[PDB]
Design a protein around this nucleic acid. Structure first.
Ligand SMILES: Nc1ncnc2c1ncn2[C@@H]1O[C@H](COP(=O)(O)CP(=O)(O)OP(=O)(O)O)[C@@H](O)[C@H]1O
Ligand SMILES: [Mg+2]
Ligand SMILES: [Zn+2]
Ligand SMILES: [Zn+2]
Ligand SMILES: [Zn+2]
Lengths: 86, 65, 196, 264, 180, 158, 133, 559, 114, 160, 43
RNA sequence: AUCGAGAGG
């Protein structure tokens, strides 16, 4: 219930971003770009929100934290900047 | 249903021959191949239009209405 | 389609100048890919080409009756008497370039049949369309401007891909979405909600 | 004569002309064949309006047949495309209007031929729209058969057109090509179970070129400049005019490319 | 057909009988019909249970006495090595049904393909009847220029397919091209 | 020997000698010690479960045991110098590329292992079409549903 | 920028297998046991007489796009009847102090073994084969 | 079962499909009218607003257009009928239902949905004619073919949904299948047949054809490869023109029984830095396989490069084959007379052996083996004799077949055909099998009423001596028909059974997935497996690799 | 139904230049021309005649799709030599050959008797 | 049968071995019989193997025969999928078939259960026992229309 | 039309399989596909 | 809508 979160120290989730979570982050960022939300990377000849989200992922500027659940209910939180994308 | 105007492959006009072609085989007991040669349809593409086609028009004519 | 079970859909149409031409100028009405034949093992298509060419040149109807002693060698002897190659293979020239084709090409007259299944008659599409009332879901059939069924197998094919939001959009927003009010103690739809 | 390509004509007929083309790259001859087949323009019925039809044949069927009927197009150059004219629908200068009316007065069936079609629009002293008859009897090509009590009446508008838009305007039926009949260039690989020479038929044109010798090596450098061809005319345009008009159509295409470049 | 003793076993039906049947075919003298042959006893009707007792021969020429340089192309036929056939098949093609009798050289093709073609003959475009223009039909489809097939079965004559065809003899090329 | 394994080490080796042009005559610059130490360090590096606790570490060691066997087979110190003229940079690049490929080769969490397995079995089953032993889709049905009777029960004794 | 190897070889036998244009040729270096060469040739392009003795040369040169041969503007690198371009895949030794060179000129395989030149025919992308009657 | 998990879907389409070699593998040929009917909601955005406005001025009937406009309040605006359809001024935040435009994610589906590869996301190219057009290489994972087949397409309606389709369901990602450790897509058509012919050392391209083929490659950098032969004439091997298509810095090695480094037979393959050193390309080289060419290119370079490679190979091979020509033929089926007579004496030897074995069975001299009926042993021996006869006749035909034989070309490439097809069409079609037995006596002691009583000879037993070319006898036709009918019955019942089996499998374990602790468990939490596959590694990366330690002698291991 | 009108393939359309010229990226003295509303008939002659000229290094044409009729021609020439000049020289030589052949065949036809 | 065995030198060798095949199976008596190798015995029937030896052995035999039916047609499937299904059957109690009874006896969510077969009866029994469904199953959220906790949906996304 | 005129249906030791007894009475190959195979045949 | 029939992969 309360304090279900695992502390940051000795995090046991995968350092690499699962393809599902990068896909979800790109989808949400493209959604908010199409919603006229502010963009934190300069754009060079791009009008499509999803490509902008990809560029932001490469710049790693997109702020969001993935809540990765565990079977017991404990959740580990990983910021986008901490996660590495290959 | 009626004699094709031109062979789809050859493009040469083939309708004008038909009326003579029949008379060629009935009047002189001519072979079909020799009749087609007399028509000048050397290629088999123009030959097939004459040989394979059948005049369904004649059956259609018989109905008075 | 033709006799012997060959089934075909014309992926494109070519004007006669684009298409390859034989030395005598005859261009094929249709052209079929070779690879369909070896798996079906239908020799009668090839012998029909041969005998139909022999019949067109000879003026004598070809005998396609089964259980009749017809030698392919004999029909090829007749075709050689006509002057065309015994196997029916004929030198052909590419239409676009005018150059002789390296491999000689086999073409002859053959019976073909048009089929009830017509592309223009079959095409169907649906935007936001009419919905059957009982399920509040798209009606059936092209005639009623209906919507295609999302099969259970298709549901699983999307499930294992991980497109959870795609499945949610396709299965909730795209069809029979609804909003209801439930009271906490009740746990049912009984609660009557007045929105105005 | 003139330095360049040279033609030696083996045979000639109003219908078919046989010739030998020399000192030519193959691409030129092929593109000329394509222009001759499709790109040469002629006159053909682009519109049919039927007022009465008692025949068994339906009107659309008949209209397709009428489109395929040959009409004289020797003076087609003086006529102008309907789309290029300023007429509302059609002009006497751009289109030729014909009328066809027939009734099966006889209990015996009366046929419809190309001799039965007549022209309304002003000729303006040009040889356009004359029905073409190669029949020995002089009767035109059959269109329909009429039993007693059957009447057909219609009006045709014939416009200028190019066979690329529809096969009807094509002025030629069969084009016969043959180059390298001995296969000295070896551009094709023969298929043979026992022997190529026995199974394969020697070409007629093959006899005109000099026979090869096996001992002589295959000339890599060799390229074929000698070609043998035969052209066929439906009778809408004479053979010589058909090939000359193909030449002129190709030169006009090239000139249009050059003119677009000058505008560039 | 019926086989009985003559001193070799010989087909009951003979040449003059065929000539009389052909003469009655030409007029359309005394009528020669299949009922006449049944009453004459030159032919019989066999159900499935009665077939068990009888013995049949595909080809009449098997009954004629036997006795090399046989042509290689001809299909291999086992010597019958049998006698006392009660009956001889009129012609093997009669086992095939109406849709199969259209198929050209089905003996040279695998049977499943013949089955598939028998399924497609129903879907084949064709002129169903000459009364089409007079008849009102919910759906009717007809070819612009129907043409008889170049190669025909003998049974096709009695199917009236040549008289009322349902396909076009198109020039067909087996070739590799653009890739469509 | 032929078994499904990840990272495809031999391909990395061909890429090694082509990416770094290799002169066969020149001796390898790699000291003998460095090859063994680097292979051990790489064995430590190829982690598949993130936890450092001893039981998850043991599961990780067992899980990567076979891959380590292959890695040792293709990275033997005699093998490295003899088969190819490995340089220190080439060996380190091979190590890093093997680690990267192994990391890519880990299953992405959240993937629906189930439906994928089910369809993986389903696809060839449709392809399966028609001597004394049950086979085909009837045999597969017998396998799937616990059958008190088998059509072809058989016992092979050795 | 000079030729890598020169020699004269006489063909022991010529055998084309499953190809009409391309034959396979076998030979050894004249007077030398250590060097022998076997390679593919287009006999239709250049007929190879049986028992014929022919001169064989390999040169490094004489990237950059190929230009059609200038009509005498650039002088011929060779009067040799036949020439090919090829690249080496691997060099091996049949024995210690015994060298073998492996090449493939446009898919036409070439193999020559010999110790008479070790530095030359060094592994490189560029290689040319020149053959005179 | 059918309304909660089988709901009919809005924004769907369906069409007869045909194949387009020029069309890119990733794309689908969506018809214009379909793209007109299909709408995507897009919020008006400062970057695209101009374009959006333009679409609304074109109108719904002509694409690119738009069918509907949604205000901030949400009251609908219909472009087909409205007084303001021409003077619209889009306020920010409004929705425009744009037509489906090129380079938009769509979901392409083949009807038997037994495979993830049957449902895959494609790019859209809007094309004139009404048939859906797909690439020839994408047919196999869908199991589709252009015999009249119909396929479905779906269009996402939200941005994160488009992103999910592009980031997960895209064709390039699904190019390497999880099952089989193998790619799905492969080059299997005329392209495969002609790639072998082009790679033949006999085949040589000419300068003009070389330039046209080089230009055909889209990513062509402009390098003109040096001709393989120069002085006699500038000629190029097909290997060079194909190597232009091979990406830089790729290395492939193929080993078979005859892959000498010399490689006189030209079997096997070697590619270094995208250059093909030796060999002739075939189905193993290109067609999807463990450690295949597509597999390597997908593994190292990435998916996009390998899809482009698909396209480039198809373009080059198709142009070359178009200019070279190819055909099946009746003469390709016809075999040499002497070889045919050798096949007939093979048949006669088989018949005599069967006769002698039957005669032994008549004398009761043979002794059965343990657990076997005498009749069973007789049936097995005769069956094996006839099988050997058919296979031997086919082998004689195959040795007699020449290299020019077109069926042999198709088989050598691997595009189509098999040894049994060649044998059945050429020499002998084999012995017919019904319910796992030779042809039985439906009538008592006679298979057919024409046959005599108690005949166990091969003609009565249903072995068809004649080939397809030679012509089947009537009895043989009926026997073959029985066999084919059993085949059709089996296929129908098999499709039903396999559908039920796949449904039960999918429903059984649909829940199971890898959780974030790498354990594989269900919703209740019960652990099916602690590590997926016991190693926790994705199946697409796995490929067969040899282990040197396990094999060999101890002495070789030491050395 | 969906089929484009036939007149499109022989006649130009609105907003369509007959020729569009764009230099090839990362190539020396090379440019691609998008002939619009044209077919193989026109392209083959241009390619062959450019190949005849020594100064024209490259000569090839392609159709991006058999559906609609357009063809791209790629030309690379010697430095100091404009590609458009090569194209126009090839065109003019083509025209001269056409005229010469037409005169010769007209004379032959007049010589012929039928 | 030809079988691979290690030679004295360690290389592959293949020595012929006599094997016996039986058309009936009574394993418990057969293994005790002398003259047979107790470690090499194998049976077609999985259930007898599970009863005689142990559940893991039965799992292995089950995977082996599934492998056999796959390889008879020449097709190949990677081990992980078959292993997942075999372990799905193996994990609970004895052996659980892929049938209506196989899934329904499981205590999973009621809706995922009702999807397969006996829909109304499963729902009735859930209603009578006042069974609580967690809604965590995929099919249950498919029916609910809510996005399933699958792939994309498994991880939550929170703002800074 | 003719093939529909000559139609047989078998409502339902294995009926679908073509039988030796069917020779000369039933067409060997004119059977519909799907579930109708074997049960329905043309004479 | 219901039921049924036929047909396509
Ligand atoms: N990989 C393959 N994909 C598609 N068809 C193939 C194929 N291999 C062979 N075929 C052909 O499939 C044909 C069988 O016809 P059908 O079963 O109706 C098409 P199918 O794809 O096999 O199954 P379907 O009925 O689900 O469409 C055979 O003639 C065979 O040549
Ligand atoms: Mg299909
Ligand atoms: Zn014709
Ligand atoms: Zn309440
Ligand atoms: Zn006008």
């Amino acid at each position: 219930l309360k304090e279900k979160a695992i502390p940051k120290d000795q995090r046991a989730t995968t350092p690499y971003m699962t393809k599902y979570e990068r896909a979800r982050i790109l989808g949400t960022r493209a959604l908010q770009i199409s919603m006229n939300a502010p963009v934190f990377v300069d754009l060079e000849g791009e009008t499509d929100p999803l490509r902008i989200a990809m560029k932001e992922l490469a710049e790693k500027k997109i702020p969001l934290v993935i809540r990765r659940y565990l079977p017991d209910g404990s959740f580990e939180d990983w910021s986008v900047e901490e996660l590495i994308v290959d | 249903m009626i004699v094709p105007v031109r062979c789809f492959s050859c493009g040469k006009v083939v309708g004008d021959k038909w009326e003579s072609y029949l008379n060629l085989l009935q009047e002189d007991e001519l072979d079909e191949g020799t009749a087609l040669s007399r028509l000048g349809l050397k290629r088999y593409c123009c030959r097939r239009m004459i040989l394979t086609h059948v005049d369904l028009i004649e059956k259609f004519l018989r109905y008075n209405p | 389609a033709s006799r012997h079970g060959q089934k075909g859909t014309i992926g494109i149409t070519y004007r006669r100048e684009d298409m390859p031409f034989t030395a005598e100028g005859i261009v094929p009405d249709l052209i079929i890919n070779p690879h369909a034949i070896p798996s079906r093992m239908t020799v009668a298509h090839l012998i029909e080409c041969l005998l139909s060419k022999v019949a067109a040149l000879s003026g004598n109807e070809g005998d396609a009756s089964p259980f009749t002693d017809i030698t392919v060698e004999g029909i090829s002897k007749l075709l050689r008497e006509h002057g065309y190659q015994s196997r029916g293979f004929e030198v052909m020239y590419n239409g676009h370039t005018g150059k002789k084709l390296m491999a000689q090409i086999f073409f002859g007259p053959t019976y073909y049949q048009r089929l009830r299944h017509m592309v223009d008659d079959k095409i169907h599409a649906r935007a936001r369309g009419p919905m059957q009332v009982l399920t509040r879901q798209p009606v059936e059939g092209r005639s009623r401007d209906g919507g295609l069924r999302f099969g259970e197998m298709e549901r699983d094919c999307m499930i294992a891909h991980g497109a959870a939001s795609f499945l949610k959009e396709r299965l909730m927003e795209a069809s029979d979405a609804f909003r209801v009010h439930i009271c906490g103690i009740c746990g049912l739809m009984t609660v009557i909600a007045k929105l105005n | 004569s003139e330095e360049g390509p040279q033609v030696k004509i083996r045979e000639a007929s109003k219908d078919n002309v046989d010739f030998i083309l020399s000192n030519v790259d193959l691409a030129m001859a092929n593109s000329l064949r394509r222009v001759m087949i499709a790109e040469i323009p002629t006159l053909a019925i682009d519109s049919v309006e039927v007022e009465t039809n008692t025949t068994v044949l339906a009107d659309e069927f008949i209209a397709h047949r009428l489109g395929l009927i040959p009409l004289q197009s020797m003076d087609i150059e003086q006529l102008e495309y309907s789309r290029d004219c300023f007429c509302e629908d059609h002009c006497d200068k751009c289109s030729v209007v014909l009328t066809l009316q027939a009734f099966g007065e006889s209990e015996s069936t009366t046929n419809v031929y190309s001799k039965d079609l007549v022209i309304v629009s002003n000729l303006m002293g040009r040889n356009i729209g004359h029905p073409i008859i190669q029949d020995k009897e002089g009767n035109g090509v059959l269109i329909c058969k009429l039993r007693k009590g059957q009447e057909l009446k219609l009006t045709c508008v014939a416009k200028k057109g190019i066979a690329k838009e529809h096969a009807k305007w094509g002025p030629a039926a069969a084009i016969e090509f043959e180059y390298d009949p001995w296969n000295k260039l070896k551009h094709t690989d023969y298929w043979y179970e026992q022997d190529s020479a026995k199974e394969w038929p020697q070409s007629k044109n093959c006899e005109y070129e000099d026979p090869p010798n096996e001992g002589d090596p295959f000339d890599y450098k060799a390229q074929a400049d000698t070609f043998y061809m035969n052209v066929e005319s439906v009778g809408s345009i004479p053979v010589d005019q058909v090939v000359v008009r193909g030449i002129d159509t190709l030169q006009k295409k090239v000139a249009s490319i050059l003119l677009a470049l000058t505008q560039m | 057909f019926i086989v009985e003793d003559d001193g070799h076993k010989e087909l009951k039906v003979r040449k003059g009988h065929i000539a009389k049947l052909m003469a009655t075919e030409y007029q359309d003298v005394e009528e020669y019909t299949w009922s006449s042959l049944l009453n004459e006893g030159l032919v019989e009707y066999i159900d499935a249970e009665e077939e068990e007792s009888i013995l049949i021969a595909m080809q009449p020429e098997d009954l004629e006495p036997a006795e090399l340089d046989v042509d290689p192309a001809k299909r291999i036929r086992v010597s019958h090595h049998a006698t006392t056939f009660t009956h001889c098949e009129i012609h093997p093609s009669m086992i095939l049904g109406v849709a199969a009798s259209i198929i050209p050289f089905p003996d040279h093709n695998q049977s499943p393909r013949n089955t598939y073609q028998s399924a497609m003959g129903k879907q084949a475009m064709g002129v169903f009847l000459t009364n089409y223009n007079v008849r009102m039909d919910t759906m009717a489809n007809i070819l612009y220029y129907p043409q008889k097939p170049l190669g025909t079965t003998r049974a096709m004559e009695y199917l009236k397919f040549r008289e009322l065809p349902a396909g076009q003899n198109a020039i067909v090329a087996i070739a590799c091209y653009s890739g469509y | 020997a032929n078994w499904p394994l990840p990272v495809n080490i031999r391909r990395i080796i061909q890429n090694a000698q082509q990416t770094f042009h290799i002169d066969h005559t020149k001796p390898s610059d790699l000291t003998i010690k460095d090859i063994v130490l680097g292979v051990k360090d790489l064995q430590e590096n190829l982690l598949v479960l993130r936890g450092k606790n001893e039981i998850i570490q043991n599961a990780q060691r067992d899980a990567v045991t076979l891959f380590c066997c292959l890695l040792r087979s293709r990275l033997a110190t005699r093998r490295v110098l003899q088969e190819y003229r490995l340089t220190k940079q080439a060996f380190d690049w091979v190590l890093s590329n093997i680690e990267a490929q192994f990391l890519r080769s880990v299953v992405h969490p959240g993937e629906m292992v189930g439906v994928l397995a089910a369809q993986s079995i389903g696809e060839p089953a449709t392809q399966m079409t028609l001597k004394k032993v049950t086979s085909g889709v009837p045999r597969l049905k017998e396998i799937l549903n616990v059958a008190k009777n088998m059509k072809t029960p058989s016992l092979t004794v050795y | 920028s000079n030729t890598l190897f020169d020699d004269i070889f006489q063909v022991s036998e010529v055998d084309p297998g499953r190809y009409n244009k391309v034959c396979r040729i076998e030979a050894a270096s004249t007077t030398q046991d250590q060097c022998k060469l076997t390679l593919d040739i287009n006999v239709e392009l250049f007929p190879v007489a049986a028992q014929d003795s022919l001169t064989v040369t390999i040169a490094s040169s004489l990237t950059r796009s190929w230009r059609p041969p200038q009509a005498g503007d650039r002088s011929l690198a060779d009067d040799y009847d036949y020439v090919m371009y090829g690249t080496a895949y691997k060099f091996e030794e049949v024995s210690k102090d015994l060298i073998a060179v492996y090449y493939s000129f446009g898919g036409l395989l070439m193999r020559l073994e010999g110790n008479y030149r070790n530095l030359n025919n060094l592994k490189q992308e560029n290689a040319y084969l020149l053959i005179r009657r | 079962r059918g309304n909660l998990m089988g709901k009919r879907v809005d924004f769907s389409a369906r069409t007869v499909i045909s194949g387009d070699p020029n069309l890119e593998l990733d794309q689908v040929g969506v018809p214009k009218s379909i793209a007109k009917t299909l709408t995507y909601p897009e919020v008006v955005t400062p970057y695209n607003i101009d374009r959006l406005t333009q679409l609304v001025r074109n109108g719904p009937n002509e694409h690119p257009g738009a069918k509907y406009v949604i205000r901030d309040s949400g009251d609908r605006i219909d472009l087909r009928y409205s007084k303001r359809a021409g003077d619209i001024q889009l306020q920010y935040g409004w929705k425009v239902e744009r037509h489906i435009m090129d380079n938009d994610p769509v979901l392409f589906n083949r009807q038997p949905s037994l495979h993830k590869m049957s449902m895959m996301a494609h790019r859209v190219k809007v094309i004139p004619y009404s048939t859906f057009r797909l690439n020839l290489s994408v047919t196999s994972p869908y199991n589709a073919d252009f015999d009249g087949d119909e396929m479905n397409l779906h269009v996402p309606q939200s941005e994160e949904t488009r992103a999910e389709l592009s980031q997960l369901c895209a064709v390039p990602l699904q190019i390497v299948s999880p099952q089989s450790n193998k790619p799905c897509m492969g080059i299997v058509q005329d392209t495969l047949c002609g790639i072998r012919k082009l790679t033949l050392r006999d085949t040589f391209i000419e300068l003009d054809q070389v330039l046209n083929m080089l230009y055909w490659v889209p990513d062509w950098d402009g390098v003109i490869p040096t001709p393989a032969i120069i002085k006699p004439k500038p000629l190029w091997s097909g290997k060079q023109i194909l190597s232009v298509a091979i990406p830089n810095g790729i290395h492939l090695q193929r080993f078979d029984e005859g892959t000498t480094l010399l490689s006189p037979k030209d079997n096997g393959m070697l590619i270094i830095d995208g250059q093909i050193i030796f060999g002739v390309v075939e189905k193993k080289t290109v067609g999807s396989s463990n450690g295949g060419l597509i597999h390597v290119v997908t593994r190292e370079k990435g998916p996009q490069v390998c899809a482009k490679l698909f396209g480039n190979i198809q373009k080059v091979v198709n142009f070359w084959l178009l200019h070279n020509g190819f055909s099946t033929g009746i003469g390709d089926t016809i075999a040499d007379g002497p070889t045919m007579r050798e096949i007939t004496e093979t048949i006669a030897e088989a018949k005599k052996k069967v006769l002698d074995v039957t005669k032994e069975a008549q004398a009761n001299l043979l002794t059965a083996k343990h657990g076997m009926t005498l009749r069973e042993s007789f049936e097995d021996n005769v069956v094996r004799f006839l099988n050997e006869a058919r296979d031997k006749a086919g082998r004689l035909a195959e040795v007699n077949l020449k290299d020019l034989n077109n069926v042999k070309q198709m088989v050598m490439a691997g595009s189509k055909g098999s040894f049994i097809n060649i044998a059945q069409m050429s020499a002998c079609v084999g012995q017919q099998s019904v319910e796992g037995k030779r042809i039985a006596f439906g009538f008592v002691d006679r298979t057919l009423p024409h046959f005599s009583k108690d005949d166990y000879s091969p003609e009565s037993k249903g072995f068809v001596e004649n080939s397809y070319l030679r012509g089947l006898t009537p009895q043989e036709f009926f026997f073959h028909a029985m066999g084919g009918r059993e085949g059709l019955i089996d296929t129908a019942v098999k499709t039903a059974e396999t559908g039920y089996i796949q449904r039960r499998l999918v429903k059984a374990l649909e829940d199971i997935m890898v959780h974030y602790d790498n354990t594989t468990r269900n919703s209740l939490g019960n652990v099916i497996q602690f590590i997926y596959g016991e190693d926790g590694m994705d199946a697409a990366h796995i490929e067969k690799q040899s282990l040197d330690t396990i094999g060999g002698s101890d002495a070789a291991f030491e050395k | 139904m969906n089929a484009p009108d036939r007149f499109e393939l022989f006649l130009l359309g609105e907003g369509e230049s007959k020729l569009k010229i764009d230099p090839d990226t990362k190539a020396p003295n090379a440019v691609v021309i998008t002939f619009e509303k044209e077919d193989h008939t026109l392209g083959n002659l241009i390619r062959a005649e450019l190949l005849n000229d020594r100064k024209v290094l490259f000569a090839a044409y392609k159709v991006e799709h058999p559906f609609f009729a357009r063809f791209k021609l790629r030309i690379q020439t010697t430095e100091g030599y404009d590609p458009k000049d090569a194209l126009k020289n090839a065109c003019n030589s083509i025209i001269n050959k056409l005229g010469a052949l037409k005169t010769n065949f007209e004379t032959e036809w007049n010589l012929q008797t039928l | 049968y030809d079988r691979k065995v290690p030679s004295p030198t360690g290389e592959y060798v293949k020595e012929p071995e006599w094997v016996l095949e039986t058309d009936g199976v009574n394993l418990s008596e057969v293994m005790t019989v002398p003259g047979i190798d107790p470690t090499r015995i194998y049976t077609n029937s999985f259930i007898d193997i599970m009863e005689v030896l142990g559940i893991e052995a039965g799992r292995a035999a089950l995977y082996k025969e599934v492998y056999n039916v796959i390889a008879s047609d020449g097709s190949y499937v990677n081990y992980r999928h078959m292993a997942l299904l075999v372990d799905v059957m193996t994990t609970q109690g004895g052996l659980t078939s892929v049938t209506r009874h196989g899934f329904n006896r499981s205590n999973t969510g009621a809706l995922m259960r009702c999807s397969f077969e006996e829909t109304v009866e499963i729902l009735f029994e859930a209603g009578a026992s006042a069974e609580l469904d967690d809604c965590r199953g995929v099919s249950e959220n498919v029916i609910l229309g809510q996005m399933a906790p699958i792939g994309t949906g498994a991880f939550d996304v929170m703002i800074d | 039309t003719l093939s529909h005129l000559r139609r047989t249906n078998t409502p339902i030791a294995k009926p679908r399989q073509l039988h030796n007894t069917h020779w000369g009475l039933v067409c060997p190959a004119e059977t519909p596909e799907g579930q109708a195979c074997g049960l329905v045949k043309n004479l």
